[PDB]
Amino acid sequence: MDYKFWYTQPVPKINDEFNESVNEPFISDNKVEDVRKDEYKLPPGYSWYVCDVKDEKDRSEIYTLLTDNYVEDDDNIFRFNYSAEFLLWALTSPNYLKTWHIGVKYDASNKLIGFISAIPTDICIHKRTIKMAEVNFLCVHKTLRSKRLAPVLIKEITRRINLENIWQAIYTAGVYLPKPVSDARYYHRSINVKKLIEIGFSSLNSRLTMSRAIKLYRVEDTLNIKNMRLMKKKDVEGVHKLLGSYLEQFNLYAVFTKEEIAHWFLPIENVIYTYVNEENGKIKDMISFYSLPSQILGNDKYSTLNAAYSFYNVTTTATFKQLMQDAILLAKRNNFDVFNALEVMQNKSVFEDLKFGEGDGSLKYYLYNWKCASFAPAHVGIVLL
Ligand SMILES: CCCCCCCCCCCCCC(=O)CSCCNC(=O)CCNC(=O)[C@H](O)C(C)(C)COP(=O)(O)OP(=O)(O)OC[C@H]1O[C@@H](n2cnc3c(N)ncnc32)[C@H](O)[C@@H]1OP(=O)(O)O
Ligand SMILES: COc1cccc(CC(=N)NC(=O)c2cccnc2OC2CCNCC2)c1
Ligand SMILES: [Cl-]
Ligand SMILES: [Cl-]
Ligand SMILES: [Cl-]
Ligand SMILES: [Mg+2]
């Protein structure tokens, strides 16, 4: 790979490493006054569009672009199918900017063919807290691939982020790019085993028959933490304390305000699930996971894999293993077929004993315009969407 676009940007080259003491921008003393005022040029017949994700129709257009053209697994059997209600939640966090929800239209048909987005958050990297954009949902239509549209989307969103005096960003990808700060394998825990077999997500052998696989993955419908219950507004201060305290141990994490705790954790059916254990008026344990279905490409019987993704889990009154066993059960009680997680935070410690299987790839975490030592994924304390 020559990385002819990425090598023009303030990111590390592919072999560039840094001492753990280095933790600073590539380019400092940036000036909002000098940022370009002009939108980047698109090829003829295409135009920028400011998407209004709060408008059901614009939001449907983004949904249809991603449903048809977003990320596939390595085996090209599944494509992520974020819901319209999920996109609303993901893109309207506190102080979000509408103008960072950027579309590209093909003028002749008036149809969205490209998109990129970001939201603002405070990110603590190696004990320094920096205002960053979290970038996600970069997508170019499958019919327009390899035409160098993605660099235009990237440069245009960078410009619009720079107008707010923000000069760093965080993002993830399954592809390798210059240059990860951390790389975390993903793992899955089967819930609806027969379905996962039928769709080719999981497999059997002469050793593990269908009935034996159903038994192996069976889960007891009883919580280890009996009073774990859906979070409500009254729990926002206690979750802000519990999760904020927990996250300070890591080398990379979001620094949530109370308003951000309410947005990111209060439950939305089919989008975000958060459960809490309240003891003596204090929130002492929390489980959370988000819903990200995959479309099952060319399957006669099933169109959709219902999948929960581990978000933030903290226990002070149980073992982590007991807490993640309850997360699995709570996902099963909400009709999910599989529970997915990354080897970040303390999650690796439970994967063997809770019968997770290793997936076939990894998610890379990246920073823009930031130099720092890379680190093992146990030190990652942020889960992106
Ligand atoms: C201070 C604020 C800063 C804000 C901005 C921060 C940075 C944010 C960066 C964005 C973070 C997004 C995070 C996120 O959304 C989560 S990762 C998921 C990204 N989306 C998909 O994979 C959906 C399906 N694929 C596509 O739509 C296209 O294949 C895309 C659009 C990915 C590339 O379209 P294309 O038609 O295939 O390709 P060209 O247009 O010809 O462009 C080729 C250039 O694109 C580089 N490329 C490929 N995939 C990338 C990826 N995932 N990130 C970054 N760069 C990626 C590639 O290395 C090459 O540059 P190089 O020549 O130097 O190698
Ligand atoms: C099963 O359907 C899939 C459809 C598309 C891709 C993948 C593999 C994959 N790339 N999985 C992950 O990236 C992943 C695995 C575990 C936890 N989080 C993840 O990704 C999240 C966070 C980053 N953005 C996408 C969703 C699987
Ligand atoms: Cl199978
Ligand atoms: Cl129970
Ligand atoms: Cl390390
Ligand atoms: Mg292109």
Side-chain angles (χ1 to χ4, degrees):
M1 293 278 277
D2 286 333
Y3 307 109
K4 294 294 157 114
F5 167 65
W6 276 110
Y7 279 8
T8 63
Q9 303 296 111
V11 302
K13 315 309 200 235
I14 222 75
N15 294 304
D16 276 0
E17 308 283 352
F18 304 93
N19 192 89
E20 71 83 46
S21 77
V22 174
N23 186 50
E24 68 186 37
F26 277 100
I27 306 172
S28 295
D29 305 297
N30 299 287
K31 300 297 203 309
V32 156
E33 154 66 20
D34 297 342
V35 178
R36 297 185 76 88
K37 303 209 193 291
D38 58 315
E39 304 171 328
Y40 278 88
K41 178 180 184 88
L42 290 159
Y46 298 85
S47 295
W48 296 112
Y49 185 69
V50 176
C51 293
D52 179 0
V53 76
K54 291 183 169 179
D55 175 81
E56 175 281 327
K57 186 169 186 178
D58 271 0
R59 176 169 70 242
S60 79
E61 289 202 293
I62 296 157
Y63 170 79
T64 291
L65 177 74
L66 308 176
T67 293
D68 292 346
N69 306 274
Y70 201 54
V71 184
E72 291 173 13
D73 65 314
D74 288 341
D75 284 351
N76 296 164
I77 303 308
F78 298 113
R79 194 177 305 119
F80 286 146
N81 183 196
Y82 291 87
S83 76
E85 288 291 300
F86 188 111
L87 295 173
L88 179 63
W89 169 75
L91 290 182
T92 62
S93 50
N95 305 309
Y96 82 98
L97 285 95
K98 185 190 185 180
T99 58
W100 291 7
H101 297 161
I102 310 186
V104 174
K105 287 201 169 222
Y106 175 55
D107 294 337
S109 72
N110 206 39
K111 284 281 233 296
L112 197 66
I113 57 79
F115 185 69
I116 189 170
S117 69
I119 50 164
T121 190
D122 272 4
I123 294 298
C124 183
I125 168 68
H126 188 89
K127 311 184 160 224
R128 292 187 59 183
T129 299
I130 304 291
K131 195 61 89 298
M132 303 200 184
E134 190 166 305
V135 177
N136 209 350
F137 305 119
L138 166 62
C139 182
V140 169
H141 203 274
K142 287 171 169 289
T143 61
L144 295 170
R145 295 280 178 81
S146 299
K147 293 170 77 64
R148 315 301 295 184
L149 282 169
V152 186
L153 280 167
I154 292 163
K155 292 183 295 188
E156 180 59 13
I157 209 175
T158 297
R159 187 190 73 78
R160 296 187 192 188
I161 292 161
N162 289 168
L163 292 169
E164 302 308 309
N165 202 28
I166 291 170
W167 304 98
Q168 277 74 39
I170 182 165
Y171 50 106
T172 58
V175 297
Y176 182 90
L177 301 167
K179 187 174 178 176
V181 294
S182 193
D183 189 354
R185 291 176 296 173
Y186 35 84
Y187 288 73
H188 45 87
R189 209 288 187 179
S190 290
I191 291 172
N192 182 343
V193 284
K194 184 158 90 46
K195 174 170 175 181
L196 302 174
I197 296 307
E198 286 191 7
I199 70 186
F201 180 101
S202 288
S203 51
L204 295 177
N205 60 68
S206 297
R207 317 226 231 78
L208 188 81
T209 53
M210 178 63 83
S211 59
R212 285 174 185 181
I214 288 169
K215 181 165 180 229
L216 173 64
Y217 297 114
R218 183 182 302 155
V219 287
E220 162 62 24
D221 193 33
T222 301
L223 287 163
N224 292 129
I225 307 166
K226 69 175 162 176
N227 291 335
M228 186 76 63
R229 60 154 173 82
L230 273 176
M231 189 189 173
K232 283 162 31 143
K233 288 181 161 218
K234 66 163 193 286
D235 305 312
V236 168
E237 184 166 349
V239 170
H240 178 239
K241 293 195 156 56
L242 178 71
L243 175 64
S245 187
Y246 179 71
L247 283 176
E248 287 195 15
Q249 67 194 284
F250 298 108
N251 200 51
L252 179 66
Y253 60 95
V255 189
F256 294 89
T257 62
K258 278 183 273 155
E259 294 91 342
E260 289 175 315
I261 296 295
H263 182 81
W264 289 113
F265 293 97
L266 284 170
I268 303 167
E269 262 272 277
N270 310 128
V271 173
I272 171 67
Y273 292 76
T274 303
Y275 293 86
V276 295
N277 184 43
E278 193 181 18
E279 175 190 295
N280 272 57
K282 283 201 182 73
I283 304 302
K284 291 196 186 183
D285 311 267
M286 73 180 287
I287 281 170
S288 59
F289 49 83
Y290 56 87
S291 179
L292 171 46
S294 289
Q295 183 175 355
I296 302 157
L297 304 174
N299 192 273
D300 304 351
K301 178 178 183 181
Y302 302 98
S303 67
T304 302
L305 167 67
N306 306 309
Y309 282 77
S310 188
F311 197 39
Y312 294 94
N313 303 290
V314 180
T315 179
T316 68
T317 68
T319 68
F320 198 63
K321 176 184 176 181
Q322 277 174 328
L323 183 78
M324 298 301 292
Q325 179 162 240
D326 288 357
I328 291 159
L329 167 63
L330 287 163
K332 179 178 174 96
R333 284 183 175 178
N334 285 284
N335 200 215
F336 292 94
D337 298 317
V338 62
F339 182 93
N340 290 295
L342 293 158
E343 59 177 343
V344 299
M345 298 179 281
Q346 303 167 261
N347 286 353
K348 179 71 149 76
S349 73
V350 303
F351 292 159
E352 179 127 63
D353 286 0
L354 293 184
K355 304 174 178 154
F356 287 73
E358 193 184 346
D360 50 35
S362 63
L363 191 68
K364 288 77 149 165
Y365 286 75
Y366 296 97
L367 299 178
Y368 186 95
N369 192 26
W370 195 260
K371 10 185 218 192
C372 62
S374 65
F375 47 89
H379 301 301
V380 173
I382 184 170
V383 175
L384 295 178
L385 307 182

